[PDB]
Design a protein around this nucleic acid. Sequence first.
RNA 1: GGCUCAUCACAUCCUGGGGCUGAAGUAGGUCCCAAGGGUAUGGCUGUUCGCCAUUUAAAGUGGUACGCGAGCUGGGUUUAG
RNA 2: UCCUUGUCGGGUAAGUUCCGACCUGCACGAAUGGCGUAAUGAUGGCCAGGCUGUCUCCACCCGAGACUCAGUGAAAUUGAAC
RNA 3: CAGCCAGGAUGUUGGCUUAGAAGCAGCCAUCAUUUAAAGAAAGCGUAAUAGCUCACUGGUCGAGUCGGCCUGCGCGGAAGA
Lengths: 122, 102, 338, 209
Amino acid sequence: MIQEQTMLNVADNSGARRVMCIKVLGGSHRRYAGVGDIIKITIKEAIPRGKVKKGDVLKAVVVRTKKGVRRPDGSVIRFDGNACVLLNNNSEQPIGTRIFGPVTRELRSEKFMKIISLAPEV
Amino acid sequence: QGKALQDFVIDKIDDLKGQDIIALDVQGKSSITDCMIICTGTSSRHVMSIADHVVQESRAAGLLPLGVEGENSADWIVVDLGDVIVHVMQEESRRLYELEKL
Amino acid sequence: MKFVDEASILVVAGDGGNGCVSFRREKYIPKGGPDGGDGGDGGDVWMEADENLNTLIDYRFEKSFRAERGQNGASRDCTGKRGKDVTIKVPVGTRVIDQGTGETMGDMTKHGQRLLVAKGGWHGLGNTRFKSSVNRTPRQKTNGTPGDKRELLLELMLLADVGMLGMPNAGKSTFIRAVSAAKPKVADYPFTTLVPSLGVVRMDNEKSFVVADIPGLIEGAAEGAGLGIRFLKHLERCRVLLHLIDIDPIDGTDPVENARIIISELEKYSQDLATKPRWLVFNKIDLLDKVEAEEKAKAIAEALGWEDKYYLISAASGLGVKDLCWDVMTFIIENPVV
Amino acid sequence: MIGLVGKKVGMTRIFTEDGVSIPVTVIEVEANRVTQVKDLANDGYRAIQVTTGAKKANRVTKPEAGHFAKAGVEAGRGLWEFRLAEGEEFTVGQSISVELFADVKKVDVTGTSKGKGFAGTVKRWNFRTQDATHGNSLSHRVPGSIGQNQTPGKVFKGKKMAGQMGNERVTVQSLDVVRVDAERNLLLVKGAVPGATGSDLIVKPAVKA
RNA sequence: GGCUCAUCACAUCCUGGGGCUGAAGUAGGUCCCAAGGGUAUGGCUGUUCGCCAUUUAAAGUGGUACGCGAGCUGGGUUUAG
RNA sequence: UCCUUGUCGGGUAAGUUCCGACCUGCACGAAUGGCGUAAUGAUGGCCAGGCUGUCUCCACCCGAGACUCAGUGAAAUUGAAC
RNA sequence: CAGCCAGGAUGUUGGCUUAGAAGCAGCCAUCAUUUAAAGAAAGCGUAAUAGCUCACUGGUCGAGUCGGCCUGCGCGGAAGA
Ligand SMILES: Nc1nc2c(ncn2[C@@H]2O[C@H](COP(=O)(O)OP(=O)(O)O)[C@@H](O)[C@H]2O)c(=O)[nH]1
Ligand SMILES: [Mg+2]
């Protein structure tokens, strides 16, 4: 349930700490983002010694949603603090070497199982 | 189909110049992945050639892979065979990430 | 995809959107401020490479390219939209030359490079920008800057990593009938191949090179002998040069002086091709005995002053074609472009 | 082909072995007793007239009672009919059971949806709401403009503006079935059907692919 | 000028059917028929327009007295200081 | 006075507004007062942090009208109107 | 006149530019003599080659054919809410 101009957390060791997504993708009049999506972000707070720098605009994938996901058996997986993983703009490969926090199993259907390979918790 | 599929891929990937293979047991640590096998390729062409081969034979092997990751980029590509996961890599980007305690 | 042609085009960049003068008049009040805005920036021209295109055939068809002229200023302080930048699809490896002591703009080596050729004119100013107290009625406007005009000589020149030149009807096209996937027209008559049909050889993964075809020619400074300098232009980025010399031609003279003059005319082309490393290989060895064509093969080397390995290659028979490829590929890898 | 008439009971879910939760609507369908058959000779179209349910004989009117006595069938809550599919034949007085839906795998459901009264324009067509601030006065959910200045001189027919919801026939296309209950006279359909509990519904096999 | 509401014509932005091509395939360019549907989110300025950032199939052109204050807005224009 | 909002920096992913500066700038202008000025101001403009239905996108509920019944009982306007 | 059945050849690969052009890339003095009805020739397919063809004639069908001039009435040029 992530929309335009939404402040999210960062769930990788790329270097960003506080991030603000600016453009959700999927089609015309794309309202809100689910759990597995390509969303464009702008860096608002990052360590000066990190791999990235403040103000850079690039793509990212949400991993945790405050609203949650919808299991096909009437179940939801809510979270406390929406988070993203850094991905390159031209290529869809993620930047961070490690992933912090659990990632839901629903990301397999969205075809980003590499994130699921990381983040040993769940 | 645990060790049977594990032995089915390690021998055949070696026949296609599969170097520096590590067999990892992750049982009890992750509930999504069973066995982590690591493959290394010389460059972008080599890792792509073996990646297409392993999914081409899987189609004729009965089991359907559940997805791929490498698109217009050979920095990281990983494909699945269900219970077993296979990671084909290159020398430069492997040391950038962490090895053998995933 | 059977002919290669080169020509020249005229590119014109749109001048900027001209300024406008106006005065707003409401339905009741007859006096209003100096309404009107700026113009639109002229459309530029971008020089973009393309994989799909391999000739300049459409450029003979269209010798003039017009950029979008910037929209004029309008009322209600309206500014015209900037003219759309016209992008021209060009095969890779093109060189462009101008007049009036003109020179090259930039060499294209990889796809995706976009080159700025024409700068469009820049927009003018309306009467509103001249707002002031003493004037209080600006009737002045600034004309848009004129667009940039030039004439481009489009020279197409192949990305031939491995370039080869040989005797007429010596089997240059037959040499492509080897592991090379290209299929040039092959026949016994001299100058069988006229269109450069470049090919590629892939021995193994991660390692491949491209080979181009250039027909032989007779000693002529001008355009005589049918072929000439117009085909030699496709050279000059060939990191290796291959020389093909016939052994015992069925009807031609045996090479004792004609194989030497072909070296001499390379010097006078423009710069002796920067004295690139040239490799000499032979052909027509299956016609005679294998051992008979050994002593006479080296005899030509010191006859022409050649001190290299003088490779013996059978293009049609297919013996030794792989041996030459192994040697050239190691030389290519050990000498990267720098 | 022909359809049946049932009563909406409620919505539940079915749990599967593989772990798929599918919402289901409980439809109570009884023995559908046909009342009279129309053919081309009589009126020019093939239709079979059927009734369902039970009604007290106290208020069953003589024209309704006489019509029911003509076919030899008992009283029914309501009366409906269905179109034939050009090649099937039925006899008057025959009761139509539920097992015919065991192979359709897709059923069309029609009925009268819930009445929502004289609803607003912001509710009937999701009219966007004007700003509730920035000087807005006495106009928060009003439709606003309804025409053009003096060129049409009127408001066009079929304008989307405030009206009354519900109490109208509503059709949901190609509703998947879950199970067919024959020994208990229940119909299970995946999804939500129009209407409230206790409202009569018409179920027909899906006409689309 | 903005919000709500839309409508009509096709000189068609996409989708659809084609012609030519200097159209090998993808990708293209021009022209013809076709209005059924769809046709953007934000910073700047009151903005129309435009620039920029980022998506998609595009972010169409005009009439509607350059639509719509007995629907709203008073930001520009705005008597009196 | 103009051109490429003047263009570089902050502020923003993107800033015709804001902030000290480059210059091709010198008119005002020194009690029709000039410069700086702490504090002060329901003063003009801009930004940031918390905050929220201002908004995507509205939904429900509580009360007074709006509706029906009973009683009393206006209005501006109106050449005539099927 | 247009059709159908055939002729299309000869000295002759016409000299330079000619790698290759020899009716079909560049020049024509435009040759004429053989049987006559046919040109060192207008078009494909390449480099010519070799082949498809044409003007022309022979045979059959057997009665109008050929394109310039003036003029009446028409067609496209002529797409909007
Ligand atoms: N026997 C034999 N014939 C060859 C060989 N190489 C080429 N040829 C023949 O040479 C003929 C002409 O070769 P070509 O393509 O014209 O070479 P080009 O003169 O450089 O254009 C071909 O028809 C081949 O049959 C060879 O190695 N052996
Ligand atoms: Mg050849």
